[PDB]
């Protein structure tokens, strides 16, 4: 066990230690590993490539700006990992590709304004996609594909229109974020959104503190009226970004 840290069975506790790094001595049973509240700022590849045992990885409230490639790929095992409240700017191709078995990826509170094209294709299992706060323009392609998805935070971006189509598929969801966007009404790309928002009001979530089931959360930019109060008619293609 490492000197900083504590453990008892397979869980190394790392957390609030003030750690500037990732330290040594992570046994190789370890099954849950919270690094979680330090300081870290780059991880060395291979770090964890040791650690084939891993369910669950803890990496959130850190000051990592990016990831080395390969990083997460011997967890296959792997289950919940955290990256929220760090200050990622961008991911690498292939970050996830390993982890079939993951069930809830976090990853906002970061400075993403993008993701790799096949980010999720390889994550047939998730139930949960946790992305507030950070600066995403456009939806990630492949949250399309995620048809196990109970949660989707897409609060706090930069979003203006959902793709037609794109949570249609997503029959499972109970818990929707899209407040703090600014929906872009006047364009006639928001229609889809509008219709599925009034489809689907009993999953729309606003945050204080906790889940607030509020459909009119997603709010038109500019004005305070809900998006799926709009009308067609008042929309246009010539008005969109
Ligand atoms: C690893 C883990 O459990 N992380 C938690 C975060 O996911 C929570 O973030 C909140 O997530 C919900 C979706 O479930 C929603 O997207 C909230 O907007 C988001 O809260 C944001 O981030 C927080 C850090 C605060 O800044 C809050 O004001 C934001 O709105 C947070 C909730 O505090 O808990 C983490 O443990
Ligand atoms: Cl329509």
């Not at 706060?133 to 492949?142: A, D, I, S, V």
Request: with cysteine; charged share 15%; aromatic share 6%.
């Amino acid at each position: 066990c490492p000197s900083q840290c504590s453990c008892s069975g397979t869980t190394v506790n790392c957390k609030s230690k003030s750690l500037a790094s990732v330290p040594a001595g992570i046994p190789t049973t370890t099954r849950v590993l919270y690094l979680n509240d330090n300081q870290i700022t780059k991880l060395e590849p291979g770090v964890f490539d040791r650690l084939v045992n891993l369910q669950t990885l803890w990496l959130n409230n850190n000051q990592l700006t990016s990831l080395p490639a390969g990083l997460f790929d011997s967890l296959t095992q792997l289950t919940i990992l955290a990256l929220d409240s760090n200050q990622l700017q961008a991911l690498p191709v292939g970050v996830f590709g390993r982890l079939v078995d993951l069930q809830q990826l976090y990853l906002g509170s970061n400075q993403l304004s993008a993701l790799p094209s096949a980010v999720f294709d390889r994550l047939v299992h998730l139930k949960e996609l946790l992305m507030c706060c950070n600066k995403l323009t456009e939806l990630p392609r492949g949250i399309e594909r995620l048809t196990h998805l109970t949660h989707l935070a897409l609060d706090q971006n930069q979003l203006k229109s959902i793709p037609h189509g794109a949570f249609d598929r997503l029959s499972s969801l109970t818990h929707a974020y899209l407040f703090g966007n600014p929906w872009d009404c006047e364009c006639r790309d928001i229609m889809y959104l509008r219709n599925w928002v009034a489809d689907h009001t009993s999953i729309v979530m606003r945050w204080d503190g906790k889940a607030v089931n509020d459909p009119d959360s997603a709010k038109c930019a500019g004005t305070n009226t809900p998006v799926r109060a709009v009308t067609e008619a008042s929309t246009s293609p010539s008005k969109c970004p």
